[PDB]
Amino acid sequence: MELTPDQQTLLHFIMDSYNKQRMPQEITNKILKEAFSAEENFLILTEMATNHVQVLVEFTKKLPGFQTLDHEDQIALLKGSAVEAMFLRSAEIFNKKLPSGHSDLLEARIRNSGISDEYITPMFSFYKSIGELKMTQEEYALLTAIVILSPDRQYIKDREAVEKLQEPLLDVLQKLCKIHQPNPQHFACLLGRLTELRTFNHHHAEMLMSHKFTPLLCEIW
Amino acid sequence: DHQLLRYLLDKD
Numbered sequence: 124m125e126l127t128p129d130q131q132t133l134l135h136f137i138m139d140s141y142n143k144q145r146m147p148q149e150i151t152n153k154i155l156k157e158a159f160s161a162e163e164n165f166l167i168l169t170e171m172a173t174n175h176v177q178v179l180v181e182f183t184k185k186l187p188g189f190q191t192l193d194h195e196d197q198i199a200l201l202k203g204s205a206v207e208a209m210f211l212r213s214a215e216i217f218n219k220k221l222p223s224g225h226s227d228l229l230e231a232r233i234r235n236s237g238i239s240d241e242y243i244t245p246m247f248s249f250y251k252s253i254g255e256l257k258m259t260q261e262e263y264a265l266l267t268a269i270v271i272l273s274p275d276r277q278y279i280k281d282r283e284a285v286e287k288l289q290e291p292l293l294d295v296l297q298k299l300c301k302i303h304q305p306n307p308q309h310f311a312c313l314l315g316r317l318t319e320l321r322t323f324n325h326h327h328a329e330m331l332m333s334h335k336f337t338p339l340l341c342e343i344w
Numbered sequence: 345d346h347q348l349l350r351y352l353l354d355k356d
């Protein structure tokens with residue numbers, strides 16, 4: 124029927140950390156004002172990417188139990204979930220945070236930045252697909268926390284300790300789906316987005332092959 | 345390796 128006091132606590136802590144995330148106004152302004160060319164457009168995206176990583180590192184550190192993990196496991200989680208967590212954040216920015224005029228200018232910059240349509244087309248399909256679900260802020264926060272605390276990233280020493288942090292989050296999300304949408308396939312649809320995000324590791328890897336970025340981007344990718 | 349990443353992780 125409802126979340127236990129322990130599950131409410133976990134959700135509260137995650138929501139707090141999710142709400143403290145902010146895309147600077149300086150960045151939204153650049154989307155609107157900066158010169159329109161492949162080099163300038165690619166440079167704005169590079170800036171947005173660096174900021175997403177900074178925002179996601181700050182969110183991750185505050186996740187319940189993340190700090191109890193080994194420091195080397197903490198880095199493997201950040202490096203392994205980067206691409207996936209960024210797309211999830213960029214989808215929320217594109218679908219919910221930006222005004223309708225700004226989204227249009229951003230799409231125009233994305234499509235004219237040197238990045239292949241082979242990458243850009245499933246990105247926008249994913250954006251439309253996540254937009255269709257009409258996800259609450261709780262669902263975006265929990266999915267982001269679930270993506271980050273994935274126990275099957277490369278170079279994780281203590282996978283079991285990571286599982287113990289991810290599993291109660293999966294339990295909370297399913298319970299929320301039952302409470303908010305008592306549409307019984309809503310959880311399965313959210314899981315579908317998790318597997319859809321995984322395909323982006325492949326499109327990003329093929330893009331990287333063809334220090335044009337930032338030191339944080341070179342380190343995390 | 346991961347010097348910038350470690351810094352953001354260890355700050356406060």
Ligand SMILES: Cc1onc(-c2ccc(Cl)cc2Cl)c1C(=O)N(C1CCCCC1)C1CCCCC1
Nearest residue numbers: 168169171172206209210213233238242243246
């Ligand atoms: C990973 C990753 O996850 N989300 C993004 C993202 C999406 C949309 C915006 Cl407007 C901004 C970003 Cl950062 C993102 C990423 O880093 N991208 C995107 C690649 C697919 C086309 C859009 C840009 C490139 C990568 C090369 C360097 C420049 C930024």
